[PDB]
């Protein structure tokens, strides 16, 4: 009644009526920002200038009726002059501090509910636990982290729709909450907010603070969880790490992700050991995930992953030979495979590598609302049987099975602007990208998959690319049934035996898991992982492993140099090089070892040629069992975040670069320390640790004709000198021993 | 590297050409609404200032 009376009063007047009539709802936004101008260009200078004035603050006229014009000492608190462009009056900060000490008192009991997030931050800080401070060589990586966790299974638009529905039921326009999660959250919040007495706008802002997920790119080390990112300024530094555990409750999904990462790292580093089982056991016993010992989590956490299963088998716990893919729990009943990196061309003219699994295999897929049995071969779907609830579930299962089969028809069905790199040019998992692309719309995938007549056996219904129940022809290899569940047996943890080399076997004697079946991806953990040992970098990422390996070699250069000179056999067997050897490509390890070792032998046979940098660079590559060969290497590769980064035998490289002006070593941009000059260094410009059977004598010598490539050095004989194009655009005269 | 007087050497007509090449095989209305901007910018005037 007040609204309509006020509207009538405004419409009675002329200017107000003209504004209300000529202005549409769209132009209301334009006129709302209408102003004479906020002539402020230096807010700090303006504030300093204004605070010297008598009455810089603005207040509503009600203040004249609530606060005296003067305090006890007669100091004026406000004046009657209005603020230009409004009807508010001018007041002094003395008025604010007078109100804070003599104003009427209210009941501020619901503020913690309105601002629950900040008080939750306070509570998390209050109950947190502080550990020691460790000084190390931090390697922070720029990644996307979450600063506002929001709700687990919601996005920004979905959260906004839920907020509108809960707070503004009649203003939701045409939106309908179709997702199950959105409906459940809306019902729960309406139940919670039932009979609420807080203003709708503030309730909307509260729900925004509670539900909307916000993410940002930051240079992070440790855990990327929201609780660990709010105190990132406290826990990580340029040279130090503070051990700290938030005092709240920890989400289960974060624990699962951190456990998977830790298990993968531990298994990968254990494979390169001489006794993998004992190394794995000790590493598991020396690791904590978010302040909790890893063994407790392994006992009380039901995670289906290969590395976690290997750890459990090593600890004698029952495992499940299952993994996760596309939201379904796969379980290989029969068959075996070997991973192979294959290059493929995408439908939208993109070239990418994929980890193709060869061999014939049979799996059973279990989903929250679907189930299936799959039989496949190398990039070939032999057959699929799906028994989902409704059409949507069966379609989702079919899409997941098609992408899982690695069919060329699936790859060629990629359309649109699909990208396989991050917005920061970081590689993405091709399979996850394909799944996300085909889950939005699989019309082209189904159309290009193919059709085939069916035999009408057992009454199992068909399915067509249009997702309809046909009975004559159906999608190639796909059938729809109703009596296939076999879901109870999925959670049937079985007792297994683990071999010394981490080969899990069944009671019968068949191999279930092996280290080769663990993913090669190098991810990051949601919760901080703490390792307690002599080498706190033993299960770290690749960059940290590289920098710390070279820093360890530099720090112990005295005894390391003596040992290299005297008894090299024991030096190559140091436990410090094994994390580095894990990074070297497996098929190359032995080869590289051989190569490097030969160089060292020559470096000992020819006196006067002792370059510290060469030995330091090549030492980590001699830690694998050598394989003799005559191959010449100009660089040695290391797997860093899925890319093969090369280390050049001669000269500086992107990874390992040494600066003579400062005598400093930089590894991937991190300072590994300064080498200390030795009197035994050969100051004659002679290199004897570059080629397998050649000695570099000097710079280019035009006498011996034009230079030739490194691989064409096999034609020379004893005592023959030649010019070689060894190095980055450099030609040098060398001779063959 | 740096480019000397980048904005004083780039011409609106070349931007019109680039837009025309980018919007090939597109509806005519889209091409027109995109092409108006270089057209207006190649006939622009500059206010001198206070004096």
């Amino acid at each position: 009644m007040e609204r309509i009376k006020e509207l009538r009063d405004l419409m009675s007047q002329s200017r107000t009526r003209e504004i209300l009539t000529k202005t549409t709802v769209d132009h209301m936004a334009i006129i709302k920002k209408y102003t004479s101008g906020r002539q402020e260009k230096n807010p700090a200078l303006r504030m300093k200038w204004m605070m010297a004035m008598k009455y810089p603050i603005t207040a509503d006229k009600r203040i004249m009726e609530m606060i005296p014009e003067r305090n006890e000492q007669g100091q004026t608190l406000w004046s009657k002059t209005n603020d230009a462009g409004s009807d508010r009056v001018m007041v002094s900060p003395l008025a604010v501090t007078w109100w804070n000490r003599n104003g009427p008192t209210t009941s501020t009991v619901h503020y913690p509910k309105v601002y629950k997030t900040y008080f939750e931050k306070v509570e998390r800080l209050k109950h947190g636990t502080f550990g020691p401070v460790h000084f190390r060589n931090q390697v922070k990586i720029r990644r996307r982290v979450d600063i506002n966790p929001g709700h687990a299974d919601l996005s920004a638009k979905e959260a906004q729709d839920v907020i509108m529905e809960v707070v503004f039921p009649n203003e939701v326009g045409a939106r309908i909450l179709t997702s199950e999660s959105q409906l459940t959250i809306t019902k729960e919040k309406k139940k919670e907010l039932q009979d609420c007495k807080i203003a709708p706008l503030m309730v909307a802002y509260m729900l925004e603070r509670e539900l909307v997920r916000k993410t940002r790119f930051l240079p992070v080390a440790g855990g990327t969880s929201s609780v660990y990112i709010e105190v990132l300024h406290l826990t990580q530094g340029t040279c130090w790490e503070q051990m700290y555990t938030p005092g709240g409750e920890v989400r289960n999904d974060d624990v699962d992700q951190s456990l998977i990462i830790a298990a993968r790292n531990i298994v990968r580093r254990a494979t390169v050991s001489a006794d993998p089982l004992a190394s794995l056991l000790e590493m598991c016993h020396s690791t904590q995930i978010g302040g909790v010992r890893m063994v407790d989590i392994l006992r009380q956490n039901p995670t289906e992953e290969q590395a976690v299963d290997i750890c459990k088998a090593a600890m004698g716990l029952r495992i499940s030979s299952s993994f996760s893919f596309g939201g379904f729990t796969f379980k290989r009943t029969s068959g075996s495979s070997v991973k192979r990196e294959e290059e493929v061309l995408t439908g939208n003219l993109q070239t990418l590598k994929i980890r193709v699994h060869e061999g014939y295999e049979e799996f059973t897929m279990v989903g929250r609302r679907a189930t299936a049995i799959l039989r496949k071969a190398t990039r070939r779907l032999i057959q699929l049987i799906v028994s989902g609830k409704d059409e949507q579930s069966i379609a989702e299962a079919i899409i997941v099975a098609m992408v899982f089969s690695q069919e060329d028809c699936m790859i060629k069905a990629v359309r649109g602007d699909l990208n396989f790199v991050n917005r920061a040019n970081q590689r993405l998992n091709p399979m996850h990208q394909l799944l996300r692309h085909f889950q939005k719309d699989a019309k082209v995938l189904f159309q290009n998959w193919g059709i085939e007549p069916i035999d009408n056996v057992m009454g199992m219904i068909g399915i067509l690319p249009d997702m309809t129940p046909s009975t004559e022809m159906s999608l190639r290899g796909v059938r729809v049934s109703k009596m296939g569940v076999d879901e109870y047996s999925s959670t049937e943890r079985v007792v297994v035996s683990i071999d010394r080399f981490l080969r899990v076997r069944d009671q019968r004697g068949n191999v279930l898991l092996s280290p080769e079946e663990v993913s090669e991806t190098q991810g990051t953990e949601k919760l901080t992982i703490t390792y307690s040992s002599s080498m706190m970098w033993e299960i770290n990422g690749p960059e940290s492993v590289l920098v710390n390996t070279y820093q360890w070699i530099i720090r112990n250069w005295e005894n390391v140099k003596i040992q290299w000179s005297q008894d090299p056999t024991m030096l190559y067997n140091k436990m410090e090089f094994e994390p580095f050897q894990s990074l070297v490509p497996k098929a190359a390890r032995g080869q590289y070892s051989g190569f490097v070792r030969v160089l060292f032998q020559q470096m000992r046979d020819v006196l006067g040629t002792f370059d510290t940098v060469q030995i330091i660079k090549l030492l980590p590559f001699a830690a694998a069992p050598p394989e003799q060969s005559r191959m010449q290497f100009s660089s040695l590769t290391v797997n860093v975040r899925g890319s093969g980064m090369r280390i050049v035998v001669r000269g500086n490289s992107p990874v390992f670069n040494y600066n003579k002006a400062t005598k400093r070593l930089t590894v991937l941009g991190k300072d590994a320390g300064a080498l200390m000059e030795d009197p035994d260094e050969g100051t004659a410009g002679v290199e004897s640790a570059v080629l397998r059977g050649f000695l570099i004598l000097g710079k280019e010598n035009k006498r011996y004709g034009p230079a030739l490539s490194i691989n064409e050095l096999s034609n020379l004989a004893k005592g023959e000198k030649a010019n070689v194009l060894i190095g980055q655009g450099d030609v040098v005269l060398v001779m063959k021993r | 590297g740096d480019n000397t007087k980048w904005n004083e050497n780039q011409n609106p007509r070349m931007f019109l050409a680039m837009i025309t090449y980018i919007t090939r095989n597109q509806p005519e209305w889209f091409r027109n609404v995109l092409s108006i901007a270089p057209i207006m910018f190649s006939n622009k005037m500059a206010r001198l200032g206070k004096g």
């Binding site: 309908i176 | 509806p27 209305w29 889209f30």
Partner: protein, 102 residues
């Protein structure tokens, strides 16, 4: 409803979708049923030839108002045919609910 209905009836307590068809009524009714994909929205279709259709053959209004609507449609059609404007107006129904940016 998934789409904006034309009317709401409080007495029957239901949304009513109204359509005016220049072609045969049944094809238009099938098109509307396909588009909305609902059975809780009463559909009522008229035509300039006096034909009519509705859900479950249900006509909410009495026959007097229906006759008034029919005669209004017939009168407008006669007026348009007098000026010779009816041919295109009939031929332009198919390309009617489409946006051609200019």
């Amino acid at each position: 409803p998934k789409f904006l209905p034309d009317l709401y009836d409080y007495k029957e307590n239901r949304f009513i979708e109204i359509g005016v068809t220049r072609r045969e009524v049944h094809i238009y009714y099938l098109e509307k049923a396909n588009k909305i994909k609902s059975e809780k929205t009463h559909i009522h279709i008229f035509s300039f030839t006096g034909e009519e259709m509705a859900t479950k053959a249900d006509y909410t209004l009495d026959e007097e108002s229906r006759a008034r609507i029919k005669t209004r449609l017939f009168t407008i059609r006669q007026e348009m045919a007098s000026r010779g404007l009816w041919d295109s107006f009939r031929q332009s129904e198919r390309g009617e609910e489409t946006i051609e940016e200019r």
